[PDB]
From Swiss-Prot:
Subunit structure as annotated in this protein's UniProt entry: Monomer.
MF GO annotations: structural constituent of eye lens
GO cellular component: cytoplasm; nucleus
Gene name, Swiss-Prot/TrEMBL: CRYGD
Protein family: Belongs to the beta/gamma-crystallin family.
Annotated Beta/gamma crystallin 'Greek key' domain residues: 1-39, 40-82, 87-127, 128-170
Recorded consequence of changing W42R: In CTRCT4; much less stable than the wild-type protein; more prone to aggregate when subjected to environmental stresses such as heat and UV irradiation
GO BP term, pick one: cellular response to reactive oxygen species
Alphabetical list of Pfam families matching this protein: Crystall (PF00030)
Protein name: Gamma-crystallin D
Keywords: Cataract, Disease variant, Eye lens protein, Repeat, Sensory transduction, Vision
Amino acid sequence: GKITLYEDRGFQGRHYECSSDHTNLQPYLSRCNSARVDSGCWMLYEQPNYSGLQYFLRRGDYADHQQWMGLSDSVRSCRLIPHSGSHRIRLYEREDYRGQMIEFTEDCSCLQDRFRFNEIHSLNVLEGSWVLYELSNYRGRQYLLMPGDYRRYQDWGATNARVGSLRRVID
């Protein structure tokens, strides 16, 4: 993957080019208001060490930070999401993989259709990376998911367990 991040809008100011994960962009970029994603699917973070608010970007040009649905021009770490050729996730009613479980292999704009709860308290990502969204139709806070066990909502860096929609990461 390849992404060039810029300090000012419309692809201006000091820029920095990534081809892999970066834990701290503050040495290279003091802010970020535009981005050209040449290839790969990326996940930008408000704070260093993949913390704070998360934003998902795919191939194409972002002239302003609102284009990746950014709440600010703060981007202080970024992750090249690993390609995956299939996706499979299991969501659970309660933590420790208890209660109602539902399995997904496709995207869902309204999670409350099939998984008839307003919160996910644990989940298992069996294949691929996903983006959880706080609200329906891919809005609100985003949480990047990768293969592995998540026994509670804090494991995916969320303040609460609220989830309305989920997408597969495809590149």
